[PDB]
Amino acid sequence: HDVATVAEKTKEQVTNVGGAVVTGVTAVAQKTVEGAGSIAAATGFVKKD
Amino acid sequence: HDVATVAEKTKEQVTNVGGAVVTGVTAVAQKTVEGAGSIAAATGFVKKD
Amino acid sequence: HDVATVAEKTKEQVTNVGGAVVTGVTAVAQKTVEGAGSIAAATGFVKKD
Amino acid sequence: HDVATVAEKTKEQVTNVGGAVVTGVTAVAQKTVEGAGSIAAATGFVKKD
Amino acid sequence: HDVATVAEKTKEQVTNVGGAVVTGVTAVAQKTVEGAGSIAAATGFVKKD
Amino acid sequence: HDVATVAEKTKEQVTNVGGAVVTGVTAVAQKTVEGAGSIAAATGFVKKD
């Protein structure tokens, strides 16, 4: 509707609506993931039906 | 509806609505994850039906 | 509707609506992912029916 | 000289001599490291002159 | 000289002499490293003159 | 000299002499590394004069 990100003299700013936003550092190191229907290393992530 | 992030002379600011936002540092190191239907290392994450 | 990212003298800024945005550093290193219907290393990610 | 790792029916075993060995899980997440000549996140590590 | 790794019915075993061995999971996520002559994220690591 | 890795019914085993061996999972995600003569993300690593 009326979402807003208002400022001045900033560095970073985000306004997501209903999705996914990834803007940072990340590191994953699996070694073994078993089973079916398994999410292993998901960072920014939405999911429905 | 009327969500808002209002300031001045800032550094970081976020306004999520209904999703996922990741803006920080992260590190995961699994070694073994068993079973089915298992989420292993999820950082920003929503989930439904 | 009326989404907005308003500032001045900034460095980075994002306004997603309903999708996915990836603007950061990421590193994944799996070794073995088993099972069917498994998401292994998804960074910015939406999903429906 | 006469270093030795002797056993039976074991799982893990290591015999380092004078170096570095890393065989475990680790996770580091800095955010800001300042200064010169600084070691930030070192896991297995020797150092001389 | 007479270094040795002796066993039976094992899983993992290492015999380094004077170097570096990395056999484990690791994850590093810096964001900002300053200064000159700085080691940031070193896992298995020897160093001389 | 007389270095040795002796076992039976094993899974992994290493015998380095004087160098570097990397046999594991790793993930690094820098964002900014400053300065001169800086090692940023070194995993298996020896170094002299």
Author numbering:
A (entry chain B), B (entry chain C), C (entry chain A), D (entry chain F), E (entry chain E), F (entry chain D): 50 to 98
From the paper:
In this work, we determined the cryo-EM structure of G51D fibril strain prepared in vitro at a resolution of 2.96 Å. The G51D FC consists of six β-strands (β1–β6) which arranges into an extended serpentine fold. In the WT1a structure, G51 is involved in the steric-zipper interface of the two protofilaments formed by residues 50–57 (50HGVATVAE57), which is assumed to be disrupted by G51D mutation. Instead, this segment with G51D mutation flips 180° perpendicular to the fibril axis and forms a β-hairpin structure with residues 60–66 in the mutant fibril. Meanwhile, V74, A76, and A78 that used to be buried inside the WT1a FC are exposed in G51D FC and form a homotypical steric-zipper interface to bundle the two protofilaments together.
α-Syn is a highly abundant presynaptic protein in neurons. It forms amyloid aggregation and condenses into Lewy bodies (LB) and Lewy neurites (LN) which are histological hallmarks of Parkinson’s disease (PD) and other synucleinopathies. α-Synuclein (α-Syn) can form different fibril strains with distinct polymorphs and neuropathologies, which is associated with the clinicopathological variability in synucleinopathies.
